[PDB]
Amino acid sequence: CTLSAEDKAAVERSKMIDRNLREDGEKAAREVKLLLLGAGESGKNTIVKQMKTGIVETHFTFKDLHFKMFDVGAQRSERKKWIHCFEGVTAIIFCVALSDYDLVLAEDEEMNRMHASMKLFDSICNNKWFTDTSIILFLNKKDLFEEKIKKSPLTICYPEYAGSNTYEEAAAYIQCQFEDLNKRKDTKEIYTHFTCSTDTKNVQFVFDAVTDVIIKNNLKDCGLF
Amino acid sequence: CCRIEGDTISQVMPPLLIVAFVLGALGNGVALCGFCFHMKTWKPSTVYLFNLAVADFLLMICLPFRTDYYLRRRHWAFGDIPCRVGLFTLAMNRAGSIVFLTVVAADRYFKVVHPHHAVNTISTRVAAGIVCTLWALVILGTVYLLLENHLCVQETAVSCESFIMESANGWHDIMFQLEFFMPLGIILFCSFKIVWSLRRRQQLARQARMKKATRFIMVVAIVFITCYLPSVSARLYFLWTVPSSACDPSVHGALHITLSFTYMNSMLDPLVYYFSSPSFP
Amino acid sequence: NTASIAQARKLVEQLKMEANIDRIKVSKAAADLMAYCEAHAKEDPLLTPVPASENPFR
Amino acid sequence: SELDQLRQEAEQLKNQIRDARKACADATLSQITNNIDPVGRIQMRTRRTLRGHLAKIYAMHWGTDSRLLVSASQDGKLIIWDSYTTNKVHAIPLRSSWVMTCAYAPSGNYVACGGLDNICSIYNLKTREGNVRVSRELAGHTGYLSCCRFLDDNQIVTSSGDTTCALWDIETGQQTTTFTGHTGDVMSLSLAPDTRLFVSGACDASAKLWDVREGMCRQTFTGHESDINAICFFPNGNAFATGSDDATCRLFDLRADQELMTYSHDNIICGITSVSFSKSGRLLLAGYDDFNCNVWDALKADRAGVLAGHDNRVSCLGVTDDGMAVATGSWDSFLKIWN
Numbered sequence A: 001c002t003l004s005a006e007d008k009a010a011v012e013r014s015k016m017i018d019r020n021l022r023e024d025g026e027k028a029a030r031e032v033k034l035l036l037l038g039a040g041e042s043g044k045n046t047i048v049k050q051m052k053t054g055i056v057e058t059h060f061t062f063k064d065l066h067f068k069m070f071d072v073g074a075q076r077s078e079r080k081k082w083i084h085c086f087e088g089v090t091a092i093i094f095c096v097a098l099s100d101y102d103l104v105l106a107e108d109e110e111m112n113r114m115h116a117s118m119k120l121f122d123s124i125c126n127n128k129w130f131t132d133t134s135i136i137l138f139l140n141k142k143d144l145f146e147e148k149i150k151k152s153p154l155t156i157c158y159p160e161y162a163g164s165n166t167y168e169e170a171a172a173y174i175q176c177q178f179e180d181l182n183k184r185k186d187t188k189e190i191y192t193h194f195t196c197s198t199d200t201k202n203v204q205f206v207f208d209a210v211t212d213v214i215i216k217n218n219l220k221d222c223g224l225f
Numbered sequence B: 001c002c003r004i005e006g007d008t009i010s011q012v013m014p015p016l017l018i019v020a021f022v023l024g025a026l027g028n029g030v031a032l033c034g035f036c037f038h039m040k041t042w043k044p045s046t047v048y049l050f051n052l053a054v055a056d057f058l059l060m061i062c063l064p065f066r067t068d069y070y071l072r073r074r075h076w077a078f079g080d081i082p083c084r085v086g087l088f089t090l091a092m093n094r095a096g097s098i099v100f101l102t103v104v105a106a107d108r109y110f111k112v113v114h115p116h117h118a119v120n121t122i123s124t125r126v127a128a129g130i131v132c133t134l135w136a137l138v139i140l141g142t143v144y145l146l147l148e149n150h151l152c153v154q155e156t157a158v159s160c161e162s163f164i165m166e167s168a169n170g171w172h173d174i175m176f177q178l179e180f181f182m183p184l185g186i187i188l189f190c191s192f193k194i195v196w197s198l199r200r201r202q203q204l205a206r207q208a209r210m211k212k213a214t215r216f217i218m219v220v221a222i223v224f225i226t227c228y229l230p231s232v233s234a235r236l237y238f239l240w241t242v243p244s245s246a247c248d249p250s251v252h253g254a255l256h257i258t259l260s261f262t263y264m265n266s267m268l269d270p271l272v273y274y275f276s277s278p279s280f281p
Numbered sequence C: 001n002t003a004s005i006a007q008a009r010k011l012v013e014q015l016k017m018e019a020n021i022d023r024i025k026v027s028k029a030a031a032d033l034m035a036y037c038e039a040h041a042k043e044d045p046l047l048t049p050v051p052a053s054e055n056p057f058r
Numbered sequence D: 001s002e003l004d005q006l007r008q009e010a011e012q013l014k015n016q017i018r019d020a021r022k023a024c025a026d027a028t029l030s031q032i033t034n035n036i037d038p039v040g041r042i043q044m045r046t047r048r049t050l051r052g053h054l055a056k057i058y059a060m061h062w063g064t065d066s067r068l069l070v071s072a073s074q075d076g077k078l079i080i081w082d083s084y085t086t087n088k089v090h091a092i093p094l095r096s097s098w099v100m101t102c103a104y105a106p107s108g109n110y111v112a113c114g115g116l117d118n119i120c121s122i123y124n125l126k127t128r129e130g131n132v133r134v135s136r137e138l139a140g141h142t143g144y145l146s147c148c149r150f151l152d153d154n155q156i157v158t159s160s161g162d163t164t165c166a167l168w169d170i171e172t173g174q175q176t177t178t179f180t181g182h183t184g185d186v187m188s189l190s191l192a193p194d195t196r197l198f199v200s201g202a203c204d205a206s207a208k209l210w211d212v213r214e215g216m217c218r219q220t221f222t223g224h225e226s227d228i229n230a231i232c233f234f235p236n237g238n239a240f241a242t243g244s245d246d247a248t249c250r251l252f253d254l255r256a257d258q259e260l261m262t263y264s265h266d267n268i269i270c271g272i273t274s275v276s277f278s279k280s281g282r283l284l285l286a287g288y289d290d291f292n293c294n295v296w297d298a299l300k301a302d303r304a305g306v307l308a309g310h311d312n313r314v315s316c317l318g319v320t321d322d323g324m325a326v327a328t329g330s331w332d333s334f335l336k337i338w339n
C-alpha cells in the first residue's frame, strides 16, 4: 500500500532481521547469566576451572542448561558506572578465599584481604541493582585454611571472635559474618558453599542455586510468587 | 416430562444467581481489563489465565437469563432456540472453565517441577494455538445441546433443563462426571507434586512469598473440589436411584441448588487467581 | 616515591598554561550565544515546529 | 620539600584561575536573557517507536543524512534503523554484548561501538560482500570504553573508563594520540563542529577541553558535584553543556572559561544520562533517570517541555543534523522519535 518495489523489499528485509532478532533473543533468554566477583585473584581461577583484557566470557553447559558466566576482573574503574549492566543476571557468584584472613592486601597499609572481601560483599549485596539478585557465595581454599588455622589464629582477623581454633567453628563464623552483610534478607537469598582446590560438586551447587532463582522467577510469571 | 413444584428453589436460586453474577462479572471484567491493557507483555501462562477469566466471565453473562427462568417459578418463555443456546452456553463455559483450570495447574506443575523443560520455552503464539484447540474441543463436546429439544411443557409451565429429573440424559451425565473426576485427578497430582517439590528446597521454602504460593496452590484445589463435588455427588445419587428418585422434589432441589456452586467457582476464580497475585498489576 | 615530582610538575605546567588564557567577558559570550540562538531560531524545527507537509516523520 | 612547594604553587595557580574567572564575570546569562521572549511550552509527540531491541539500549547516534540511526543494546546487536519508515537496515551481532557506546560515521560508511571489552570495533557498512563486517578492533584502553566519536573515516576519538581519552588511526589501528589529565573515569565525549577541539566529561566532576592536533588539555571546567555522564557542544562550537548525577545541567563557554547557567529543578533529583542540543541551541534536551526527557530553555533555564513515554531510564539522546527530530533511547528496549 503506497510502497514501491524497493520499499516493499526493504520492509521484507526488516522483517527477516526482526525474525533473526527474535530467534537470538529466545536463544539468549534460556541462558543463565552469572556475574563472577571477588577481591583480587583469590579463587576465581579455580572456580573457572571447575566450570570449564576487559570482560571474560565463560560458557559451560550442565544438565541441558547453558550458563554465561562473566568475569569483571581487571576492570579497575568505578564499579557503579558499569554494574547496572549486570542488573538482569540470574545470580552473582562471589568467590572468597578462606586463607587470606591473615594476609595483607599490600595496596593499603594495615589492610586485610578478608576485610576487603567483606567490604566488596557489602557493596555488591546491598547494591541498588542487586536487590532481588541471589548471591552464590563460594568460600575458596578450605583445606589450606584448615591446615593454616593451627599456625595462625583467626583472632588476628576478627578481634571479637572468641570460638575455638577449629576449622568447622571458624568456617561457620566466617560464613555467618559474610551473611550478616545482607541487609535485604527478606528479598534475596545467599547460598554459601565451601570449595577446596579440586572439588567436583561446585557446578551442582551453582545449578541448584540457579534452579531456586528460576523457580522464584517462574512463580512471579504464574502470579503465584 | 414432569411437574415439580419446589417453591424452595424459587427462594434460594434467584438470589444466589444474582449475587454470583454481580460479583463474578465485576471480578472477571476487572481481571480481563488488567490482562488486556495493563499487562504489556504476555507469557504462555498469562494466555491460560486470560482464557480462564474469559470462560468464567461468559458464564456470568449466561446467569441473568437463568435467574429470570427461576424468578418465573421455573417457566421458560423466551422460546425453544434461546433455551438450547442458554443451556449450551452454560455447559460450554463450565467445561471451558474446568479445562483452563486444569491447563493452569499443568503449567504450574511444569514450571515448578520441571523448570528446565522444553514445555516452558514455548511462545505466546503456541500458547494461543493450544487455548484455541482447547476451545474448539470444548465447543465440539457441548454442541449436542444444540441438536435437541430441551423444552418440557406441563400445565403452561415450560422447563428448559439439561439435567432432567425424568432420567439420565446420557452423554450430558457422562460428560458431567468426567469433566470432574478427570481434571480432579490431574489437578490433585499437579498440586501434590508442586507443594512437595517446593518443600524440598529448604532455602526457598523459608521465604514468606514461597509459603504464600504453597498455600494458594492448595487453596485453588480446595475451591474446585468444594465447588464441583456437591453437584457431581447429587447427580450420582440421582442416577443410581433413578427409579425411585424420578421427579423427586428433594433430589431435584438438591441438584438445582448444588449446580449453582459451579457458578460460585467462576466468581471466586478471579479472587484466587488474579487478585491474590502479588505481581499482577 | 620520587616519581610523584614529575606528576606534580606536569600538573602545575597544565595549570600554568590554563591560567595564561585570554578570556572574553561573560556578557560578551552570553550575547554571542543569544545572537546565535536568534539568528537560527527560524531554522530550528524543534523550537519552531514545521507544518506536517514539511515534516518527514508525519 | 619540593612536593609541598609544588602543591602550594598549584593552589596559588588555582586561586589565580578562580580570581581571573571571578573578575571577568560581570553579568550572567540570566541577567541579559531575562528581557527576551521565552520559548513557551514545547510539546513533542512520539512519531515513531523503533522496536526490535530486547535489552537495555545504552547508546545511539544519528546519521548526517538525518534519517539513518544506529543503536546499541546489551543484546549484542547494533541495529541500524531507517527512522522514516521504521525499517531495520542492518543488524550487527557484536562479539561482546556489553556495549555502552556507539557512533555512526559522518560519511555513513562505518559504525563504531565499544563497552566493557575495552575495544572500539569499527564496522564496515558498505562492503562488496553485502554484509556488515568488522573493519578492525581498536585495542589499547585498559578501562571500559564509554564513548566514541568519528572525526572522519580514518580518525576516531574514543572516551574510556581508564581516565583517558584516545585518538585512533583506523588505517593502522594504532594509538595516535592519548589525552590524559582526568582523575575519574571519562564517561562522555563530544566533538566540535569543525572537529578541531573536543570536550570530555568524567567522574571527577570536571570537564576538559582538548585539542586533537596537539593532544593536550586547553581548559578545565568545574562546577558539578557528581559524576558527569553527558556532554554536548553548542552548535557554534563556542560553548557546551554537561549533565551529571546531581540533577543539574551546566552550560560552559570556551572563551569565557566559566559556567554560565545551571539547568536544575527542585522536583528533579535523579541523575542525567544524556544531553543534546537543538539545531539553534535554544532548546537543551536532557535525558534523566526518572524515565523521561526534559526540554530546557538553554538561554533561560526554564523547563520548555517534558518528553514522557519511556517505561525505564532514558539512557541516550540524539538530535538530527537538520534539527528536525529528537530521538530518545531508554532501558526499556525502545527508541522513540519526537517532533
Ligand SMILES: O=C(O)c1cc(O)cc(Cl)c1
Residues within 6 Å of the ligand: B087, B090, B091, B160, B161, B162, B163, B164, B255, B256, B257, B259, B260
Ligand atoms: O447447565 C447448567 O448449569 C444447569 C442446567 C440445568 O438444567 C439446571 C441447572 Cl441448576 C444448571
